[PDB]
Amino acid sequence: KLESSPVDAVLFVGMSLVLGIASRHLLRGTRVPYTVALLVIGIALGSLEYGAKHNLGKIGHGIRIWNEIDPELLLAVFLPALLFESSFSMEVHQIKRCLGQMVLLAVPGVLISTACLGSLVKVTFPYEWDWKTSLLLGGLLSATDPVAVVALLKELGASKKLSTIIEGESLMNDGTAIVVFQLFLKMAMGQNSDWSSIIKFLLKVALGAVGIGLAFGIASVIWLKFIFNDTVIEITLTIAVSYFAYYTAQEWAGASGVLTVMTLGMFYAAFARTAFKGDSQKSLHHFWEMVAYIANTLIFILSGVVIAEGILDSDKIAYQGNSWRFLFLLYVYIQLSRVVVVGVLYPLLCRFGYGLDWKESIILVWSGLRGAVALALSLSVKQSSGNSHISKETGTLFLFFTGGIVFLTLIVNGSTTQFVLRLLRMDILPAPKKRILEYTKYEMLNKALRAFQDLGDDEELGPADWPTVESYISSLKGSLDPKSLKDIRMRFLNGVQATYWEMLDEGRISEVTANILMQSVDEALDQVSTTLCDWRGLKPHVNFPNYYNFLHSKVVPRKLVTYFAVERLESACYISAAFLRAHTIARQQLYDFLGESNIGSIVINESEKEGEEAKKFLEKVRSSFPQVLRVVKTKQVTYSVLNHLLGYIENLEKVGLLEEKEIAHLHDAVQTGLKKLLRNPPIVKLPKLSDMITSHPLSVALPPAFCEPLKHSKKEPMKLRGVTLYKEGSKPTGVWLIFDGIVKWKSKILSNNHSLHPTFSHGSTLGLYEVLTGKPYLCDLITDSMVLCFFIDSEKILSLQSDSTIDDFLWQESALVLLKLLRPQIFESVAMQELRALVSTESSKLTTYVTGESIEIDCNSIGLLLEGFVKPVGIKEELISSPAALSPSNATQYIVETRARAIIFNIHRGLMSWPENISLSERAMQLSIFGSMVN
Amino acid sequence: KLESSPVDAVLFVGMSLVLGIASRHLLRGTRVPYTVALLVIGIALGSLEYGAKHNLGKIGHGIRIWNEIDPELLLAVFLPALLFESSFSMEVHQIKRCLGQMVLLAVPGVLISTACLGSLVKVTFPYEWDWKTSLLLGGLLSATDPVAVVALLKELGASKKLSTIIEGESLMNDGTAIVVFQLFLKMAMGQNSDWSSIIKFLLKVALGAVGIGLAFGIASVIWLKFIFNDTVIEITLTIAVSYFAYYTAQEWAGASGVLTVMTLGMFYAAFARTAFKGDSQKSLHHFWEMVAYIANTLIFILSGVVIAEGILDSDKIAYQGNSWRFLFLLYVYIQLSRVVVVGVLYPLLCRFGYGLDWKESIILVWSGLRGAVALALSLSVKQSSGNSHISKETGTLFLFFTGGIVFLTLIVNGSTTQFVLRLLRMDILPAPKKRILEYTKYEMLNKALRAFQDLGDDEELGPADWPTVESYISSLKGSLDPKSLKDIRMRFLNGVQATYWEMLDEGRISEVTANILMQSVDEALDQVSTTLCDWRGLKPHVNFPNYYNFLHSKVVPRKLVTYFAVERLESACYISAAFLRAHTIARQQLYDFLGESNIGSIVINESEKEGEEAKKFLEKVRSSFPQVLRVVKTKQVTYSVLNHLLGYIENLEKVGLLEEKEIAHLHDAVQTGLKKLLRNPPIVKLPKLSDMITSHPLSVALPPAFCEPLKHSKKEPMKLRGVTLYKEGSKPTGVWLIFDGIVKWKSKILSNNHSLHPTFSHGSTLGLYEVLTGKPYLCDLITDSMVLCFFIDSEKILSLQSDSTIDDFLWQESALVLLKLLRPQIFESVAMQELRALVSTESSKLTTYVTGESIEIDCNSIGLLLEGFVKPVGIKEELISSPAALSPSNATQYIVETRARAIIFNIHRGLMSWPENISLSERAMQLSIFGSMVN
């Protein structure tokens, strides 16, 4: 026989964790949460251990040990646990769009709710309660648990906007209610209620906790930017910094430790994605979610134990009618308090942020769930009761009322939110959104089929049983009237979504950028029957305010401007580039699928005109800071490269191939490089018109000794958008090398057959064919952006034309742009770098045909004419001339009239068109690979 | 001004975490560990707070709050934290190979060390210490921290065998030292030292801690097998179960809680890989490593504080010469005890487990590191001192000596291990292992180059800067004399390694199976100059003990027999199949690379003869339990399928594409299927010779109404290995469908040109061509395993030959095996399922050529003769006959003599040969992307 040995606290915490795990496991699909079961279990335990004084042995000893937990220690240990992950698991890029909508619900909402509840309880509750203590009860009861609301919101189908609003409101409500509760608790203890002291305390708490949290977050983020490869240190740093900032705010500064911890979580959500490594973030979120879960379980059991102790003390409170007949009244008042706040803020809530529909307002009511934050506050009040300011009855009554309110809310509000959402039809998947799920439910089945195919022969083990395999993926299994103008836009937006998906899979865009773009397109699908509203959801993230232009002054160094310019314009430039590239690809895909149609042209024109704002922002970036785009492109490319290397390194880790020391060294080096780059923007030099020439494909790879002495002293290559390089039909004068920018070509004799994006990227030589053959310019070039380009006189090209080893590459370089001009149907979608491989192969050879010979074009080959005339075989005598292209008849043969040079060449997700793009030997193949006809 | 408010414990823990993080960060490459810095910091803090009584404010208040930590609570909270992750992060498949070599070091080593140290201190230490106290000090000082040894072993290059031995020895030493310390502590308090009581206490502690840990592990694993998709619950269950089992052993059973927690960790390592999901197992390990780190930091600071209190109490102990002149003596004694233990166990250690070289024995000495386990034990003794049995001086001296020993070990033993491993040349990479690092360092550079290629055009942002990209991966940049018979075998083993890598990447084999196979091959490269010794590392994992055969009795149901057979014969079957497939692929690769050579043939014969044991084990599995191989194949395939689906769903979560509810539902369904599969083996039915016929590519896909009534009543299709189906040259009688098994073909007219694996897998029709044309059998068929096959009379085939739609498929089916017979060089490496796609396409020109016609074979085409005679064009008059194959001359043309049927067709990592298998347009392409000539 022992008596409350301190080891019994370990018993209590372990038993509480076991009970919480059991409650969470058993109550998964049921309406009731596991927290109410935990509270009931704690109530029963405390009742049978205090009101009956049963000999619980060591189980009761731990209960009694935890019963005298310090009010300050309870909040110091359990409140940082409850609210760190909710602040940490926050999407700042999504909270930036409804900051105002939640702030109106944060400060004014909490103030109105606290005032209404305090006035109601002071008027009604027959406990002779002072105004200070009634306002304290109202303030602590205005706190809403983020854990409960996020658990409820994911339980049933709710819109992303509404879920974000509710989660942000709950977190901000806890943040403000903590301050309100602390203020009224200080007032209730010994402090005079003079407005000067109240204002000073509010300042020292709010703007003395926010500042402390910001300072701690800045210091810890700077530290994390130097902890290269250690997940354990990174996860431990969050614990240490949060639990040290809570102490420094509560004890050393007198501020609010809870608000400091929440501010630290906000800072981590905002400014710590470059600090925590990608591998560490998932484990960090899991750990903090588990810590919040443990705090919820421990608090919901301990509060039940202490409620059972207080109300089953000397048998008055539990048996008094003034408790059970006024808990319901307090529930009614806190429900009416929510209605009052919602109704008061509605005339202005719907005009801010995401807006607020009447259905969303009805959901805003009944979504107020009280959890372990209010429970912890009331338990701290109970443990600090018994003084003259707060009697033992007052603190016990506060804790009992808060527990009853928590139980009633989690029982009724959650079940009603189930009923109301299902009644307002806001939980049904929309028609254009219950079409991409079907796509990523038939694609998953295709991936499963391919995985079965790969593991198919295995003669040593034998054949697998396909029905058994499909028994585990059975959950995966269960036109577009082009004259619509509504379904066409939906298919185009599906193509944009697929392009964003491919860009993320390729690693071209980050996860947050991909999330922003995908949510923008998701907004677009809702407003699809009017126009293409997908850039409307991206302009919040794409802004170029005019106060960046003053950075060109001497007040700051030019090299110092780049870091700020890159940091501010990083996400916006990535978003704009992804937007424009996705719409280019989707325009090409839509034309390829729908063919030539009026509605397709309408949608293409809509997309082209919508991309204007993104093009304008990118042009503003080009004109203001030339090097920011290059820096961010290099950062993006190297981030993708290092992520690919890191993934390969984890694959190597999964294989017992290399020694652990060497794998550790490689992983440490790659993570160190990744942190060194994701920490600060890469430093990239600026070319002096000689580096661009050297990097250009034409130069260095052709001229042995060109005008190199003139490179260091040459005119500015900066050309504004819309500047015409040369006119169509004019006599050749020289070539225009493209270094950086976009130039667009238009022509009349060279008809724009099917080109939608007739532009030439960097590293392209223009005007070479005209200055080689002498034929006039086939098209005019207009710059679509700030283009860096060089002009070389045609006489230099003609002089270089002396050598055949120069001639063949010159003709290939000319063909590089001829393929894009003559046949833009299938040679415009492909990139220039991919087109380099087609011409650099040995199968494509520059052959100077002799007069009277025959040119034969294969079925999977396309020929181009560089000079001379060609006459078709088997067709009417229509003499073909310079440029022009040869295509298979299924003319497979030609006639070489005069001297001619000819070159013969060789020959994306389907989300845009999912339902349309999808013997006996094949049947036997299917039987050999599946055992039946299941494909 | 306050006085030790309980909130100051939060200060202490947060400040200790911050100090530990700072010490770990600052001391990373330095010789000294961060734990000695933590101990020094704690010593300084305790000294200036007690010996000087400085006003530390709230910092000292937390120190004085933690100083009163209960001896029982300190071990209940901090000891499970220290030793759970070391037991959890333990490879059972690797410790099973050296159980004896560390059990010798576990019980006998700890006993000898404790006895020697206790006798030495009792004889020498001038504190009038009883034998019980001296033995207690020896027992607690014989504990070695797993954290310190694993940190040291990863710091410098040590062999996998030696590192595993050291880690297992440290963990087992802690496990035994806890029991020894508890026994001597109970003896020192009030218990009689009679052998009956000692035996009873040892029995109760040992086998009531191991038993309780096993029971808790079984219950928790059964629970985890039903927690489908919740990582937080899975990680919390480990905490709850460990900290509840510690209490149940220490308080409710009187056993050792530490041993119970360690046994629970062992059970989690062994029988919990299918219980914890793959997603959780990384965050779980991270969390428990962090918990161990926090426990280490807190203990190393608190022990320093308490040592500074005890020695800087009333100023005697710190200033006594008998402390500083006997701490060094105790260090010498513990070093001598380590030397004695190693020397005594060496004559029989080297005959067990992995063996023990003299260099490995020298490394075993100086590798004994004392950490937070001994520190925690001595701190518990100090906190429980002051009684009559143990005085305050005795406990203070125990704690001081243990802290000094910990400091001295972590300072000197680590440095000596650094100096000696470098001196014994055991840290240098071997020659055949400093060739796969080079392979997976040129391959990472290739992957980086390809990643730069993918993000290469991007006209909108511009071109990336390749030098900046390579500045972050610069860490990657810095014959085989075939007449060797040593380098050839090394290349073959590298090919086997590459095949295992491809099997893991494809998802064919699990991570643990891949690790076992790869470490077997790593063992092989060491003894490469003698023979192919890589199966020796797999026969520990591949065993078929004779007591499995008794399961066929009536004592147990047959349906229950399969289960135990599946878990027992799962890893061994997978390992054997991977072994055989990898050696087949490596034999083919070696023939392809080296061509025809004597040494290549020698290595191929070595591999073929060595795979005999794996073939025999698989044949034993076939004969004993026919359905186990099919069940494990189905489980493997479905596991791969579900893992691919899980990766796809993770990527889809990374994309803001699907609604959270729907994607969560998909993830939950996939994880539920994965858990339901990893919990119990898949249930697969047994065919009745009709299901196999139906699933065969020939039947159902050919006969409308075949002998189906005879399917239910037919002879047994079981054929033993080596049974000949039909003889070569005999007249055709029928066909032999292959349902399950391996059949080998040998021939002389076919000459067996270059076939290394002349076998036919399941789903193949054999003898069809002979029964169609009437020509005698081209080869004889011998079964290489238990083959399920069916025989159909040739007259049925001839009757079916009536329909042309039947005839074309029959001829294609015959060609399916003809390509493998006529041209095995290029048509045996490909699988049968892949060969189905070659014949099922429309390019198969199965045309009955007329006499006098011309057969033309393209350069990328291969012709096959089904009947008749064909004459070459432009070649000597050598008439070709039935079978035989046509190949391009660079004969491109042929002459059809009589009626003939012909068909025209169309046309792995390089680790085996890494250093050997690796213009102007191409130069321009190279310069266009990177801006220079870097490739």
mmCIF file of C-alpha atoms in Angstrom, chain B residues 41-261:
data_model
loop_
_atom_site.group_PDB
_atom_site.id
_atom_site.type_symbol
_atom_site.label_atom_id
_atom_site.label_comp_id
_atom_site.label_asym_id
_atom_site.label_seq_id
_atom_site.Cartn_x
_atom_site.Cartn_y
_atom_site.Cartn_z
ATOM 1 C CA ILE B 41 27.055 23.385 -18.731
ATOM 2 C CA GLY B 42 24.986 21.605 -16.088
ATOM 3 C CA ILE B 43 28.028 21.360 -13.816
ATOM 4 C CA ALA B 44 28.700 25.086 -14.172
ATOM 5 C CA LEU B 45 25.055 26.020 -13.567
ATOM 6 C CA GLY B 46 24.737 23.830 -10.483
ATOM 7 C CA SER B 47 28.076 25.095 -9.178
ATOM 8 C CA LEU B 48 27.230 28.782 -9.486
ATOM 9 C CA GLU B 49 23.700 28.181 -8.160
ATOM 10 C CA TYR B 50 24.560 26.031 -5.101
ATOM 11 C CA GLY B 51 28.250 26.437 -4.249
ATOM 12 C CA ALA B 52 28.000 30.200 -4.772
ATOM 13 C CA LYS B 53 24.241 30.637 -4.136
ATOM 14 C CA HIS B 54 23.988 33.210 -6.919
ATOM 15 C CA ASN B 55 20.589 34.802 -7.523
ATOM 16 C CA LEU B 56 19.695 33.130 -10.815
ATOM 17 C CA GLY B 57 16.079 34.284 -10.606
ATOM 18 C CA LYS B 58 13.549 32.053 -12.324
ATOM 19 C CA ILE B 59 16.361 30.082 -13.991
ATOM 20 C CA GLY B 60 17.603 28.825 -10.629
ATOM 21 C CA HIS B 61 14.026 28.163 -9.529
ATOM 22 C CA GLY B 62 13.616 25.583 -12.289
ATOM 23 C CA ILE B 63 16.949 24.036 -11.313
ATOM 24 C CA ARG B 64 15.783 23.657 -7.713
ATOM 25 C CA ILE B 65 12.422 22.292 -8.883
ATOM 26 C CA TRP B 66 14.082 19.620 -11.029
ATOM 27 C CA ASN B 67 16.600 18.765 -8.297
ATOM 28 C CA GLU B 68 13.782 17.144 -6.278
ATOM 29 C CA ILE B 69 12.900 14.737 -9.097
ATOM 30 C CA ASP B 70 11.794 11.421 -7.644
ATOM 31 C CA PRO B 71 14.256 8.544 -8.208
ATOM 32 C CA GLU B 72 11.369 6.374 -9.403
ATOM 33 C CA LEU B 73 9.756 9.089 -11.545
ATOM 34 C CA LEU B 74 13.084 9.972 -13.177
ATOM 35 C CA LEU B 75 13.516 6.392 -14.393
ATOM 36 C CA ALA B 76 9.819 6.066 -15.261
ATOM 37 C CA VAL B 77 9.918 9.115 -17.544
ATOM 38 C CA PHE B 78 13.447 9.263 -18.959
ATOM 39 C CA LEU B 79 14.561 5.629 -19.285
ATOM 40 C CA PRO B 80 11.749 4.552 -21.664
ATOM 41 C CA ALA B 81 12.648 7.604 -23.753
ATOM 42 C CA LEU B 82 16.339 6.690 -23.935
ATOM 43 C CA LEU B 83 16.015 3.040 -24.937
ATOM 44 C CA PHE B 84 12.770 2.730 -26.918
ATOM 45 C CA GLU B 85 14.174 4.092 -30.180
ATOM 46 C CA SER B 86 17.387 2.061 -29.941
ATOM 47 C CA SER B 87 15.283 -1.087 -29.580
ATOM 48 C CA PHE B 88 12.849 0.186 -32.220
ATOM 49 C CA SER B 89 15.583 1.092 -34.732
ATOM 50 C CA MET B 90 16.944 -2.451 -34.723
ATOM 51 C CA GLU B 91 17.162 -4.728 -37.772
ATOM 52 C CA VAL B 92 15.910 -8.151 -36.692
ATOM 53 C CA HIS B 93 16.930 -9.738 -40.003
ATOM 54 C CA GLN B 94 20.487 -8.538 -39.280
ATOM 55 C CA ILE B 95 20.674 -9.274 -35.542
ATOM 56 C CA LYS B 96 19.306 -12.772 -36.211
ATOM 57 C CA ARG B 97 22.545 -13.490 -38.093
ATOM 58 C CA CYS B 98 24.625 -12.617 -34.999
ATOM 59 C CA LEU B 99 22.368 -13.467 -32.057
ATOM 60 C CA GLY B 100 24.991 -15.607 -30.345
ATOM 61 C CA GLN B 101 27.902 -13.218 -30.810
ATOM 62 C CA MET B 102 26.065 -10.552 -28.787
ATOM 63 C CA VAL B 103 24.306 -12.894 -26.339
ATOM 64 C CA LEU B 104 27.846 -13.883 -25.362
ATOM 65 C CA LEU B 105 28.435 -10.166 -24.806
ATOM 66 C CA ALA B 106 25.006 -9.637 -23.213
ATOM 67 C CA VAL B 107 24.730 -11.931 -20.186
ATOM 68 C CA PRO B 108 28.299 -13.278 -19.702
ATOM 69 C CA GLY B 109 29.962 -10.021 -20.733
ATOM 70 C CA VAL B 110 27.913 -7.913 -18.332
ATOM 71 C CA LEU B 111 28.390 -10.470 -15.548
ATOM 72 C CA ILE B 112 32.175 -10.542 -16.005
ATOM 73 C CA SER B 113 32.443 -6.752 -16.276
ATOM 74 C CA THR B 114 30.267 -6.195 -13.199
ATOM 75 C CA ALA B 115 32.186 -8.766 -11.152
ATOM 76 C CA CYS B 116 35.594 -7.392 -12.148
ATOM 77 C CA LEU B 117 34.664 -3.744 -11.580
ATOM 78 C CA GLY B 118 32.928 -4.446 -8.273
ATOM 79 C CA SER B 119 35.827 -6.505 -6.947
ATOM 80 C CA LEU B 120 38.338 -3.852 -8.016
ATOM 81 C CA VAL B 121 36.434 -0.970 -6.414
ATOM 82 C CA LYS B 122 35.719 -2.967 -3.244
ATOM 83 C CA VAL B 123 39.411 -3.813 -2.869
ATOM 84 C CA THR B 124 40.692 -0.347 -3.800
ATOM 85 C CA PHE B 125 38.128 2.378 -3.041
ATOM 86 C CA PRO B 126 38.702 3.769 0.499
ATOM 87 C CA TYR B 127 35.050 4.502 1.312
ATOM 88 C CA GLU B 128 34.379 1.376 3.429
ATOM 89 C CA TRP B 129 31.870 0.330 0.779
ATOM 90 C CA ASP B 130 30.039 -2.958 1.186
ATOM 91 C CA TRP B 131 30.271 -5.642 -1.480
ATOM 92 C CA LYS B 132 26.647 -4.878 -2.377
ATOM 93 C CA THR B 133 27.394 -1.201 -3.047
ATOM 94 C CA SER B 134 30.564 -1.993 -5.007
ATOM 95 C CA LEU B 135 28.684 -4.528 -7.131
ATOM 96 C CA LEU B 136 25.910 -1.962 -7.640
ATOM 97 C CA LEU B 137 28.449 0.572 -8.908
ATOM 98 C CA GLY B 138 30.007 -2.032 -11.193
ATOM 99 C CA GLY B 139 26.623 -3.073 -12.550
ATOM 100 C CA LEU B 140 25.454 0.464 -13.273
ATOM 101 C CA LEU B 141 28.835 1.348 -14.797
ATOM 102 C CA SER B 142 28.679 -1.651 -17.161
ATOM 103 C CA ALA B 143 25.818 -0.035 -19.113
ATOM 104 C CA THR B 144 26.714 1.372 -22.535
ATOM 105 C CA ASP B 145 24.575 4.010 -24.232
ATOM 106 C CA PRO B 146 23.298 2.907 -27.667
ATOM 107 C CA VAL B 147 22.888 6.559 -28.689
ATOM 108 C CA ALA B 148 26.575 7.351 -28.190
ATOM 109 C CA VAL B 149 27.802 4.248 -30.021
ATOM 110 C CA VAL B 150 25.457 4.733 -32.984
ATOM 111 C CA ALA B 151 26.512 8.391 -33.184
ATOM 112 C CA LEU B 152 30.184 7.377 -33.139
ATOM 113 C CA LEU B 153 29.851 4.507 -35.628
ATOM 114 C CA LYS B 154 28.149 6.697 -38.241
ATOM 115 C CA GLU B 155 30.781 9.411 -37.718
ATOM 116 C CA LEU B 156 33.615 7.400 -39.297
ATOM 117 C CA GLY B 157 33.773 4.535 -41.769
ATOM 118 C CA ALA B 158 33.209 1.189 -40.064
ATOM 119 C CA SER B 159 32.150 -2.114 -41.584
ATOM 120 C CA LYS B 160 28.471 -3.027 -41.444
ATOM 121 C CA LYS B 161 29.213 -6.235 -39.522
ATOM 122 C CA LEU B 162 31.297 -4.449 -36.884
ATOM 123 C CA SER B 163 28.809 -1.591 -36.503
ATOM 124 C CA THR B 164 25.906 -4.026 -36.123
ATOM 125 C CA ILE B 165 27.850 -6.055 -33.554
ATOM 126 C CA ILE B 166 28.723 -2.939 -31.547
ATOM 127 C CA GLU B 167 25.164 -1.562 -31.619
ATOM 128 C CA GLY B 168 23.599 -4.871 -30.611
ATOM 129 C CA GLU B 169 26.196 -5.320 -27.881
ATOM 130 C CA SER B 170 25.480 -1.857 -26.469
ATOM 131 C CA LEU B 171 21.720 -2.432 -26.454
ATOM 132 C CA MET B 172 22.017 -5.887 -24.867
ATOM 133 C CA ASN B 173 24.537 -4.541 -22.343
ATOM 134 C CA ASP B 174 22.032 -1.912 -21.242
ATOM 135 C CA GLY B 175 19.314 -4.558 -21.042
ATOM 136 C CA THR B 176 21.395 -6.810 -18.791
ATOM 137 C CA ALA B 177 22.923 -3.965 -16.763
ATOM 138 C CA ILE B 178 19.480 -2.661 -15.790
ATOM 139 C CA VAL B 179 18.654 -6.080 -14.325
ATOM 140 C CA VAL B 180 22.031 -6.342 -12.571
ATOM 141 C CA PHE B 181 21.691 -2.830 -11.132
ATOM 142 C CA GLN B 182 18.150 -3.515 -9.919
ATOM 143 C CA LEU B 183 19.247 -6.775 -8.286
ATOM 144 C CA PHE B 184 22.153 -5.175 -6.433
ATOM 145 C CA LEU B 185 20.044 -2.150 -5.458
ATOM 146 C CA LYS B 186 17.374 -4.414 -3.968
ATOM 147 C CA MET B 187 20.121 -6.344 -2.173
ATOM 148 C CA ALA B 188 21.596 -3.113 -0.792
ATOM 149 C CA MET B 189 18.299 -1.835 0.655
ATOM 150 C CA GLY B 190 16.819 -4.468 2.957
ATOM 151 C CA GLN B 191 16.838 -7.862 1.270
ATOM 152 C CA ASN B 192 18.660 -10.972 2.452
ATOM 153 C CA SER B 193 21.393 -12.243 0.128
ATOM 154 C CA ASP B 194 20.262 -15.867 -0.007
ATOM 155 C CA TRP B 195 20.554 -17.737 -3.296
ATOM 156 C CA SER B 196 16.878 -18.749 -3.293
ATOM 157 C CA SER B 197 15.698 -15.137 -3.044
ATOM 158 C CA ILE B 198 18.276 -13.986 -5.606
ATOM 159 C CA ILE B 199 17.164 -16.667 -8.075
ATOM 160 C CA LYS B 200 13.487 -15.859 -7.505
ATOM 161 C CA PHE B 201 14.077 -12.128 -7.997
ATOM 162 C CA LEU B 202 16.146 -12.673 -11.147
ATOM 163 C CA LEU B 203 13.469 -14.979 -12.566
ATOM 164 C CA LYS B 204 10.657 -12.548 -11.745
ATOM 165 C CA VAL B 205 12.455 -9.481 -13.117
ATOM 166 C CA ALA B 206 13.820 -11.085 -16.292
ATOM 167 C CA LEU B 207 10.936 -13.342 -17.326
ATOM 168 C CA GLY B 208 8.191 -11.086 -16.100
ATOM 169 C CA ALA B 209 9.613 -8.102 -17.915
ATOM 170 C CA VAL B 210 10.233 -9.999 -21.152
ATOM 171 C CA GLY B 211 6.830 -11.666 -20.858
ATOM 172 C CA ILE B 212 4.988 -8.431 -20.091
ATOM 173 C CA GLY B 213 6.746 -6.666 -22.960
ATOM 174 C CA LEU B 214 5.843 -9.508 -25.315
ATOM 175 C CA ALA B 215 2.191 -9.451 -24.230
ATOM 176 C CA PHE B 216 1.973 -5.670 -24.629
ATOM 177 C CA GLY B 217 3.653 -5.891 -28.030
ATOM 178 C CA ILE B 218 1.263 -8.599 -29.210
ATOM 179 C CA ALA B 219 -1.773 -6.613 -28.068
ATOM 180 C CA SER B 220 -0.519 -3.350 -29.574
ATOM 181 C CA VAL B 221 0.432 -4.994 -32.885
ATOM 182 C CA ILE B 222 -3.015 -6.591 -33.119
ATOM 183 C CA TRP B 223 -4.490 -3.147 -32.435
ATOM 184 C CA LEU B 224 -2.271 -1.487 -35.062
ATOM 185 C CA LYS B 225 -3.372 -4.066 -37.629
ATOM 186 C CA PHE B 226 -6.840 -2.468 -37.339
ATOM 187 C CA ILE B 227 -5.892 1.247 -37.241
ATOM 188 C CA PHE B 228 -6.086 1.709 -40.997
ATOM 189 C CA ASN B 229 -5.398 5.396 -41.739
ATOM 190 C CA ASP B 230 -4.325 7.510 -38.769
ATOM 191 C CA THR B 231 -0.619 8.272 -38.340
ATOM 192 C CA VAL B 232 -1.198 10.239 -35.126
ATOM 193 C CA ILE B 233 -2.927 7.313 -33.401
ATOM 194 C CA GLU B 234 -0.162 4.954 -34.524
ATOM 195 C CA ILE B 235 2.590 7.174 -33.112
ATOM 196 C CA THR B 236 0.635 7.837 -29.897
ATOM 197 C CA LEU B 237 0.029 4.110 -29.390
ATOM 198 C CA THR B 238 3.766 3.487 -29.076
ATOM 199 C CA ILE B 239 4.057 6.154 -26.364
ATOM 200 C CA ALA B 240 0.998 4.924 -24.478
ATOM 201 C CA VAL B 241 1.950 1.245 -24.633
ATOM 202 C CA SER B 242 5.601 1.811 -23.704
ATOM 203 C CA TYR B 243 4.833 4.102 -20.762
ATOM 204 C CA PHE B 244 2.020 1.814 -19.584
ATOM 205 C CA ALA B 245 4.132 -1.344 -19.851
ATOM 206 C CA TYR B 246 6.911 0.347 -17.881
ATOM 207 C CA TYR B 247 4.433 1.091 -15.097
ATOM 208 C CA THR B 248 2.848 -2.374 -15.219
ATOM 209 C CA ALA B 249 6.283 -3.974 -14.878
ATOM 210 C CA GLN B 250 7.702 -1.605 -12.261
ATOM 211 C CA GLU B 251 4.467 -1.055 -10.272
ATOM 212 C CA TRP B 252 1.946 -3.985 -10.460
ATOM 213 C CA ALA B 253 4.421 -6.794 -11.173
ATOM 214 C CA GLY B 254 7.736 -5.863 -9.538
ATOM 215 C CA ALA B 255 9.644 -6.656 -12.737
ATOM 216 C CA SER B 256 12.011 -4.350 -14.641
ATOM 217 C CA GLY B 257 10.166 -1.656 -16.563
ATOM 218 C CA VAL B 258 13.258 -0.834 -18.621
ATOM 219 C CA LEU B 259 13.590 -4.438 -19.782
ATOM 220 C CA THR B 260 9.866 -4.454 -20.590
ATOM 221 C CA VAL B 261 10.214 -1.311 -22.716
#
